[PDB]
Design an enzyme around this catalytic site. Structure first.
Site, PDB file in Angstrom:
ATOM      1  N   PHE A 130       0.798  -1.215   0.000  1.00  0.00           N
ATOM      2  CA  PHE A 130       0.000   0.000   0.000  1.00  0.00           C
ATOM      3  C   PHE A 130       0.841   1.281   0.000  1.00  0.00           C
ATOM      4  CE2 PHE A 130      -4.699  -1.025   0.982  1.00  0.00           C
ATOM      5  CZ  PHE A 130      -4.603  -2.344   0.632  1.00  0.00           C
TER       6      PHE A 130
ATOM      7  N   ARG B  94       2.661   0.770 -16.145  1.00  0.00           N
ATOM      8  CA  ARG B  94       3.834   1.554 -15.780  1.00  0.00           C
ATOM      9  C   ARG B  94       4.066   1.463 -14.261  1.00  0.00           C
ATOM     10  NH1 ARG B  94       4.933   8.118 -16.490  1.00  0.00           N
ATOM     11  NH2 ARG B  94       7.222   7.962 -16.395  1.00  0.00           N
TER      12      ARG B  94
ATOM     13  N   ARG C   6       9.857  -4.717  -5.723  1.00  0.00           N
ATOM     14  CA  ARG C   6       9.433  -5.864  -4.925  1.00  0.00           C
ATOM     15  C   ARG C   6       9.872  -7.219  -5.472  1.00  0.00           C
ATOM     16  NH1 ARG C   6       8.470  -2.866  -0.344  1.00  0.00           N
ATOM     17  NH2 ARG C   6       7.132  -1.081  -0.886  1.00  0.00           N
TER      18      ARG C   6
HETATM   19  C1  LIG Z   1      13.421  -2.701  -0.434  1.00  0.00           C
HETATM   20  C2  LIG Z   1      12.552  -1.578   0.060  1.00  0.00           C
HETATM   21  C3  LIG Z   1      12.744  -1.059   1.315  1.00  0.00           C
HETATM   22  C4  LIG Z   1      11.949  -0.035   1.801  1.00  0.00           C
HETATM   23  C5  LIG Z   1      10.945   0.510   0.976  1.00  0.00           C
HETATM   24  C6  LIG Z   1      10.746  -0.009  -0.304  1.00  0.00           C
HETATM   25  C7  LIG Z   1      11.541  -1.012  -0.789  1.00  0.00           C
HETATM   26  C8  LIG Z   1      11.302  -1.559  -2.171  1.00  0.00           C
HETATM   27  N1  LIG Z   1      10.151   1.573   1.474  1.00  0.00           N
HETATM   28  C9  LIG Z   1       8.972   2.044   0.707  1.00  0.00           C
HETATM   29  C10 LIG Z   1       9.320   3.178  -0.266  1.00  0.00           C
HETATM   30  O1  LIG Z   1       9.763   4.333   0.438  1.00  0.00           O
HETATM   31  C11 LIG Z   1       8.139   3.564  -1.161  1.00  0.00           C
HETATM   32  O2  LIG Z   1       7.090   4.037  -0.320  1.00  0.00           O
HETATM   33  C12 LIG Z   1       7.595   2.437  -2.040  1.00  0.00           C
HETATM   34  O3  LIG Z   1       8.708   1.728  -2.603  1.00  0.00           O
HETATM   35  C13 LIG Z   1       6.689   2.945  -3.139  1.00  0.00           C
HETATM   36  O4  LIG Z   1       7.577   3.309  -4.234  1.00  0.00           O
HETATM   37  P1  LIG Z   1       7.220   4.527  -5.194  1.00  0.00           P
HETATM   38  O5  LIG Z   1       7.033   5.811  -4.462  1.00  0.00           O
HETATM   39  O6  LIG Z   1       8.266   4.464  -6.255  1.00  0.00           O
HETATM   40  O7  LIG Z   1       5.798   4.051  -5.757  1.00  0.00           O
HETATM   41  P2  LIG Z   1       4.404   4.832  -5.917  1.00  0.00           P
HETATM   42  O8  LIG Z   1       3.435   3.892  -6.573  1.00  0.00           O
HETATM   43  O9  LIG Z   1       4.032   5.495  -4.639  1.00  0.00           O
HETATM   44  O10 LIG Z   1       4.815   5.946  -6.984  1.00  0.00           O
HETATM   45  C14 LIG Z   1       5.123   5.530  -8.345  1.00  0.00           C
HETATM   46  C15 LIG Z   1       5.963   6.610  -8.974  1.00  0.00           C
HETATM   47  O11 LIG Z   1       5.256   7.879  -8.907  1.00  0.00           O
HETATM   48  C16 LIG Z   1       6.127   8.902  -8.480  1.00  0.00           C
HETATM   49  N2  LIG Z   1       5.609   9.424  -7.229  1.00  0.00           N
HETATM   50  C17 LIG Z   1       4.417   9.056  -6.649  1.00  0.00           C
HETATM   51  N3  LIG Z   1       4.033   9.885  -5.702  1.00  0.00           N
HETATM   52  C18 LIG Z   1       5.008  10.878  -5.694  1.00  0.00           C
HETATM   53  C19 LIG Z   1       5.171  12.060  -4.939  1.00  0.00           C
HETATM   54  N4  LIG Z   1       4.272  12.524  -4.071  1.00  0.00           N
HETATM   55  N5  LIG Z   1       6.220  12.853  -5.254  1.00  0.00           N
HETATM   56  C20 LIG Z   1       7.117  12.411  -6.143  1.00  0.00           C
HETATM   57  N6  LIG Z   1       7.039  11.359  -6.951  1.00  0.00           N
HETATM   58  C21 LIG Z   1       5.961  10.614  -6.656  1.00  0.00           C
HETATM   59  C22 LIG Z   1       7.547   8.350  -8.561  1.00  0.00           C
HETATM   60  O12 LIG Z   1       8.068   8.502  -9.865  1.00  0.00           O
HETATM   61  C23 LIG Z   1       7.288   6.872  -8.258  1.00  0.00           C
HETATM   62  O13 LIG Z   1       8.277   6.010  -8.794  1.00  0.00           O
HETATM   63  C24 LIG Z   1      10.464   2.169   2.685  1.00  0.00           C
HETATM   64  N7  LIG Z   1       9.761   3.261   3.101  1.00  0.00           N
HETATM   65  C25 LIG Z   1       9.985   3.859   4.301  1.00  0.00           C
HETATM   66  O14 LIG Z   1       9.265   4.778   4.643  1.00  0.00           O
HETATM   67  N8  LIG Z   1      10.879   3.242   5.147  1.00  0.00           N
HETATM   68  C26 LIG Z   1      11.655   2.143   4.807  1.00  0.00           C
HETATM   69  O15 LIG Z   1      12.533   1.764   5.584  1.00  0.00           O
HETATM   70  C27 LIG Z   1      11.451   1.590   3.520  1.00  0.00           C
HETATM   71  N9  LIG Z   1      12.135   0.479   3.078  1.00  0.00           N
HETATM   72  C1  LIG Z   2      11.849  14.406 -25.139  1.00  0.00           C
HETATM   73  C2  LIG Z   2      10.392  14.216 -24.818  1.00  0.00           C
HETATM   74  C3  LIG Z   2       9.481  14.034 -25.828  1.00  0.00           C
HETATM   75  C4  LIG Z   2       8.138  13.835 -25.557  1.00  0.00           C
HETATM   76  C5  LIG Z   2       7.695  13.825 -24.215  1.00  0.00           C
HETATM   77  C6  LIG Z   2       8.618  13.995 -23.186  1.00  0.00           C
HETATM   78  C7  LIG Z   2       9.944  14.196 -23.453  1.00  0.00           C
HETATM   79  C8  LIG Z   2      10.919  14.357 -22.320  1.00  0.00           C
HETATM   80  N1  LIG Z   2       6.321  13.603 -23.946  1.00  0.00           N
HETATM   81  C9  LIG Z   2       5.787  13.817 -22.573  1.00  0.00           C
HETATM   82  C10 LIG Z   2       5.784  12.549 -21.714  1.00  0.00           C
HETATM   83  O1  LIG Z   2       4.886  11.564 -22.258  1.00  0.00           O
HETATM   84  C11 LIG Z   2       5.366  12.816 -20.261  1.00  0.00           C
HETATM   85  O2  LIG Z   2       4.004  13.211 -20.264  1.00  0.00           O
HETATM   86  C12 LIG Z   2       6.152  13.871 -19.476  1.00  0.00           C
HETATM   87  O3  LIG Z   2       7.550  13.666 -19.720  1.00  0.00           O
HETATM   88  C13 LIG Z   2       5.860  13.774 -18.000  1.00  0.00           C
HETATM   89  O4  LIG Z   2       6.670  12.637 -17.603  1.00  0.00           O
HETATM   90  P1  LIG Z   2       6.343  11.777 -16.303  1.00  0.00           P
HETATM   91  O5  LIG Z   2       5.124  10.959 -16.486  1.00  0.00           O
HETATM   92  O6  LIG Z   2       7.624  11.042 -16.060  1.00  0.00           O
HETATM   93  O7  LIG Z   2       6.127  12.899 -15.184  1.00  0.00           O
HETATM   94  P2  LIG Z   2       4.942  13.151 -14.136  1.00  0.00           P
HETATM   95  O8  LIG Z   2       5.313  14.351 -13.323  1.00  0.00           O
HETATM   96  O9  LIG Z   2       3.651  13.104 -14.872  1.00  0.00           O
HETATM   97  O10 LIG Z   2       5.034  11.838 -13.221  1.00  0.00           O
HETATM   98  C14 LIG Z   2       6.172  11.665 -12.353  1.00  0.00           C
HETATM   99  C15 LIG Z   2       6.327  10.190 -12.096  1.00  0.00           C
HETATM  100  O11 LIG Z   2       5.130   9.665 -11.463  1.00  0.00           O
HETATM  101  C16 LIG Z   2       4.742   8.450 -12.064  1.00  0.00           C
HETATM  102  N2  LIG Z   2       3.412   8.624 -12.651  1.00  0.00           N
HETATM  103  C17 LIG Z   2       2.647   9.763 -12.594  1.00  0.00           C
HETATM  104  N3  LIG Z   2       1.414   9.570 -13.004  1.00  0.00           N
HETATM  105  C18 LIG Z   2       1.353   8.218 -13.310  1.00  0.00           C
HETATM  106  C19 LIG Z   2       0.312   7.397 -13.795  1.00  0.00           C
HETATM  107  N4  LIG Z   2      -0.940   7.811 -13.962  1.00  0.00           N
HETATM  108  N5  LIG Z   2       0.587   6.083 -13.962  1.00  0.00           N
HETATM  109  C20 LIG Z   2       1.834   5.657 -13.723  1.00  0.00           C
HETATM  110  N6  LIG Z   2       2.879   6.326 -13.244  1.00  0.00           N
HETATM  111  C21 LIG Z   2       2.574   7.623 -13.071  1.00  0.00           C
HETATM  112  C22 LIG Z   2       5.902   7.995 -12.944  1.00  0.00           C
HETATM  113  O12 LIG Z   2       6.818   7.247 -12.178  1.00  0.00           O
HETATM  114  C23 LIG Z   2       6.524   9.334 -13.350  1.00  0.00           C
HETATM  115  O13 LIG Z   2       7.911   9.184 -13.610  1.00  0.00           O
HETATM  116  C24 LIG Z   2       5.468  13.199 -24.965  1.00  0.00           C
HETATM  117  N7  LIG Z   2       4.168  12.874 -24.686  1.00  0.00           N
HETATM  118  C25 LIG Z   2       3.280  12.523 -25.663  1.00  0.00           C
HETATM  119  O14 LIG Z   2       2.135  12.256 -25.364  1.00  0.00           O
HETATM  120  N8  LIG Z   2       3.710  12.585 -26.965  1.00  0.00           N
HETATM  121  C26 LIG Z   2       4.997  12.922 -27.349  1.00  0.00           C
HETATM  122  O15 LIG Z   2       5.292  12.876 -28.537  1.00  0.00           O
HETATM  123  C27 LIG Z   2       5.917  13.242 -26.315  1.00  0.00           C
HETATM  124  N9  LIG Z   2       7.218  13.629 -26.580  1.00  0.00           N
END
Ligand SMILES: Cc1cc2c(cc1C)N(C[C@H](O)[C@H](O)[C@H](O)COP(=O)(O)OP(=O)(O)OC[C@H]1O[C@@H](n3cnc4c(N)ncnc43)[C@H](O)[C@@H]1O)c1[nH]c(=O)[nH]c(=O)c1N2
Ligand SMILES: Cc1cc2c(cc1C)N(C[C@H](O)[C@H](O)[C@H](O)COP(=O)(O)OP(=O)(O)OC[C@H]1O[C@@H](n3cnc4c(N)ncnc43)[C@H](O)[C@@H]1O)c1[nH]c(=O)[nH]c(=O)c1N2
Ligand SMILES: Cc1cc2c(cc1C)N(C[C@H](O)[C@H](O)[C@H](O)COP(=O)(O)OP(=O)(O)OC[C@H]1O[C@@H](n3cnc4c(N)ncnc43)[C@H](O)[C@@H]1O)c1[nH]c(=O)[nH]c(=O)c1N2
Ligand SMILES: Cc1cc2c(cc1C)N(C[C@H](O)[C@H](O)[C@H](O)COP(=O)(O)OP(=O)(O)OC[C@H]1O[C@@H](n3cnc4c(N)ncnc43)[C@H](O)[C@@H]1O)c1[nH]c(=O)[nH]c(=O)c1N2
Lengths: 220, 218, 217, 216
Positions: D73, D161, D170
């Site tokens: 979660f 994604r 995980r």
């Molecule tokens: C092996 C291991 C060990 C630990 C942990 C994880 C793992 C895999 N965690 C949990 C970890 O901090 C994290 O909460 C989960 O791995 C969820 O990962 P994401 O945030 O990448 O997924 P999530 O599904 O929440 O987000 C997916 C993606 O969205 C983006 N994202 C989502 N919400 C965002 C936000 N508000 N701002 C910026 N980007 C955002 C990022 O790009 C991220 O990769 C942890 N946690 C902890 O508190 N203490 C611990 O000691 C550990 N230990």
């Molecule tokens: C050089 C280049 C060229 C292009 C584009 C980008 C760049 C850098 N894009 C834009 C691209 O598809 C994207 O929308 C932006 O780069 C925002 O990227 P993130 O989703 O990583 O950031 P964002 O800030 O939206 O999210 C941050 C992180 O949160 C997670 N995340 C957030 N929302 C999520 C969701 N709903 N599900 C899963 N994970 C989520 C991911 O881990 C992500 O890295 C594009 N786009 C397009 O439509 N057509 C195009 O032709 C192009 N061309």
């Protein structure tokens, strides 16, 4: 700012970015304007709240440090529009503290045994689970396995970074009588700190947007 | 306070910031029931989190920027959903002119049949015609929300951007890179510059271990 | 399912995961009770603000819309988008030209037909300038910046029912720009066809806008 | 598709929207040539064009111990609906590690005794909970004595994604063994529904270790 909750818990303010004027500044960019004077700026906060203009409130951010039982943390962590960092159950040193409800927690409920006995029975099973956990650890069982016997009332700690819009959604849902009493208490502490840092947004929130009940019946 | 001018009339200005490198150190150390330690150990922890992919501690550092950029750049920027925006309303605001006119140097490396100076002039000319057409429609009672649809994509807009360091580093990975449009690369360089000033340890560790782009290293 | 919007736009349903029963299953937490009880549960969740079960219903739409509409739409962050690239994609170079009826109710100094003509005229000049730049070797990423905000783009929009209902609350409303209200009416229509119980309960208990209660969808 | 995990757990596929071609169509913005379509999937994965994969969505039904659910979660970019500890009826089942879970650890007592001690405290906690419930204590209070190995159930709706981010974190030896087992089952279902995306993910983007060592 630190507020004690339950027998051993707390909500502490670590940091905050902005105040009511941060939402005023963010909203005024719409008409190519900036800040004005106190009365006009407070009037704008009320206007935004009264008409559902929520995005300006995202520019106000808080970081809290919370110590709460795991059953409360599980409910809290369902709020996905926020950032968390919590104590690791696998590797962290813990204080090994547990929430023991006082007999007053069972007031209003018709129980077959006195509420004092409920409190005692909870302390007793907590003590046995804790002793079993210590026996497993002492015998070389890794913490990630040994800790699974610990009860849901064990205290954890975490940092919570949340913007005012998501914090107001949290207050709508948790500072309410439908939420579990234990998380209502934590939500009252969050509301108190929010009110101190953003008085205009908090007052306008209670007046126009707040959907719960307890913040309109209890002074925070 | 920090302000960097971009393009002919744009800018990126720092409005506010919550935290610094130690905010990520504090958030990470809660895992072992610890807090801060000393300078060397704390900087070593930042590099350790960066190189091993422990990204969530960096979410506790937040920035608010005030940006002025052309609409074609803002459309690319606003695709970053993990952030907060508040932008100028073209429906309810007076159009205070301002369009991005590329300088002749923007066309360097391209073999054009007309001098790059003429490209700059042709862009100013169509911008001027669209702007006066917009003023004519407004003066005749056409609502702003309809009249503004004739304005070109190089029209400047303004917005507040509130973003945490983790999402800001994802933005830099994607936009501070030669595959991104030159105009947004310039804005991403200003974002990186302000981030470096406020979070030097996180920025240095990011460049060293996690940064996927090219231009920040050049 | 495809619905035409404006002069050249559309909203087309590409795919959908689930239906009203997906929210019922998520609320009861069971992959396995009577149409009347299931419809009663949908109304109960809608009326009491239990929104998370509706996130398990997902839609994918293909939209053709002017850039000024797409910029407003793309402000909805709790959704997935893939759009045509302004730097590299081939475009049809179509533009939204408002019909004279768009100016009804407004007291204009010139006939609304002349506003329509002036918009087509500046569009034609910007398009011709763009072609002149392209023909002279200016890259599309630079030349296209002279194109007006009414140029049509296309995108895929994947959104769950909870975020879709937030979108309808905000865009299927008279405070939103008329052009996006038209697109939101099409989104509401497709949502109603796929999730009739959720849509009816939404209008009855949770919908905060005005136009979906005044216009037959 | 249902896969058993641990002693009483599982991962079951409830629904899915799309397949590999949903990412192909999203990337081209177009609503069939196998070789070109598979080449596009690898191209997007290799160059980091991740957003087309968000148009593939899954709904799973998961039964897991609370200590595993708490880790799961933490993935915020997903939708959850879980059994209510305050009001829902429960099966009252618990994860009891088998002696093999303690393989490689030098314990002062036999691993079988660790398993017995865990079953024993679980049984006492459960009996205490039943005594409190029978005496009129509300479930929301009585349940706080239950251990972290109690099984909960939830629906998880997640796009490909976010699911690939979950597998990166995980389906890896640094994650707790229990959640690695669940991530292997999720990988298996994902592979069955999106074989091209799964293979391209392992080839270019996957950062973990176990999915390149174990066939799922
Ligand atoms: C092996 C291991 C060990 C630990 C942990 C994880 C793992 C895999 N965690 C949990 C970890 O901090 C994290 O909460 C989960 O791995 C969820 O990962 P994401 O945030 O990448 O997924 P999530 O599904 O929440 O987000 C997916 C993606 O969205 C983006 N994202 C989502 N919400 C965002 C936000 N508000 N701002 C910026 N980007 C955002 C990022 O790009 C991220 O990769 C942890 N946690 C902890 O508190 N203490 C611990 O000691 C550990 N230990
Ligand atoms: C050089 C280049 C060229 C292009 C584009 C980008 C760049 C850098 N894009 C834009 C691209 O598809 C994207 O929308 C932006 O780069 C925002 O990227 P993130 O989703 O990583 O950031 P964002 O800030 O939206 O999210 C941050 C992180 O949160 C997670 N995340 C957030 N929302 C999520 C969701 N709903 N599900 C899963 N994970 C989520 C991911 O881990 C992500 O890295 C594009 N786009 C397009 O439509 N057509 C195009 O032709 C192009 N061309
Ligand atoms: C009294 C009571 C009782 C219960 C519950 C809550 C309360 C208050 N819950 C928990 C509930 O389902 C929910 O997980 C939390 O209240 C978090 O609420 P939000 O999603 O509003 O906040 P969150 O912080 O997650 O999101 C804030 C806002 O962002 C939007 N949002 C975020 N992610 C989104 C997404 N992926 N799609 C669409 N919009 C999204 C929504 O607008 C939301 O209001 C529950 N849960 C459960 O599983 N079983 C139960 O029995 C109960 N019981
Ligand atoms: C009539 C009208 C007029 C305007 C505008 C909208 C409308 C309807 N807007 C746009 C508005 O500010 C907003 O960007 C969009 O309506 C998207 O709405 P949500 O954020 O609710 O949807 P979105 O899909 O982004 O989010 C869904 C839900 O998730 C939550 N959420 C998502 N991300 C969050 C975050 N980071 N923090 C907290 N909660 C989050 C909220 O609960 C939200 O309702 C605006 N904008 C502007 O800049 N200037 C203007 O002048 C106008 N004018």
């Amino acid at each position: 700012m630190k507020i004690d909750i339950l027998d051993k818990g707390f909500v502490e303010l670590v940091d905050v970015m902005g105040n009511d004027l941060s939402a005023v500044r963010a909203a005024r960019v719409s008409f190519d304007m900036g800040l004005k004077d106190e009365e006009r700026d407070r009037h704008l906060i009320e206007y935004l709240m009264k008409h559902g203009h929520e995005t300006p409130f995202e520019h106000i951010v808080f970081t809290f440090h919370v110590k709460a039982p795991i059953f409360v943390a599980r409910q809290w962590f369902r709020h996905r529009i926020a950032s968390y960092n919590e104590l690791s159950g696998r590797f962290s040193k813990l204080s090994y503290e547990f929430y023991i409800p006082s007999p007053e927690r069972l007031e209003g409920y018709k129980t077959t045994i006195p509420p004092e006995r409920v409190t005692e029975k909870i302390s007793e099973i907590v003590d046995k689970a804790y002793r079993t956990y210590l026996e497993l650890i002492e015998s070389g069982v890794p913490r990630e396995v040994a800790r699974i016997v610990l009860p849901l009332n064990l205290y954890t700690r975490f940092f919570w970074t949340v913007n005012a819009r998501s914090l107001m959604n949290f207050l709508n849902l948790r500072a309410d009588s439908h939420a579990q009493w234990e998380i209502q208490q934590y939500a009252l502490a969050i509301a108190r700190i929010f009110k101190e840092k953003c008085p205009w947004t908090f007052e306008a929130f209670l007046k126009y947007a707040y959907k719960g009940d307890i913040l309109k019946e209890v002074q925070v």
